[PDB]
């Protein structure tokens, strides 16, 4: 459990470090938000734990 949480708290930083590096682009945001799927989905542990 305490490593699934570490994985999720690491797939979030690797997302806001790209939402802020894309100072010019929109696709990498709308492609996620328009999809109701888990925006913070992290398969390598999230898809097992679930």
């Amino acid at each position: 459990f305490r490593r699934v949480e570490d994985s999720w708290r690491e797939a979030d930083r690797a997302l806001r470090q790209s939402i802020i590096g894309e100072q010019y682009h929109r696709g990498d945001i709308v492609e996620r938000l328009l999809n109701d799927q888990d925006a913070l989905l992290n398969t390598p542990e999230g898809r097992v734990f679930d």
Binding site: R9, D12, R13, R16, Q17, I20
Partner: peptide, 10 residues
């Protein structure tokens, strides 16, 4: 809290 968590460190 999350916004600052990117810059100031955790």
């Amino acid at each position: 809290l999350p916004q600052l968590q990117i810059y100031l460190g955790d």
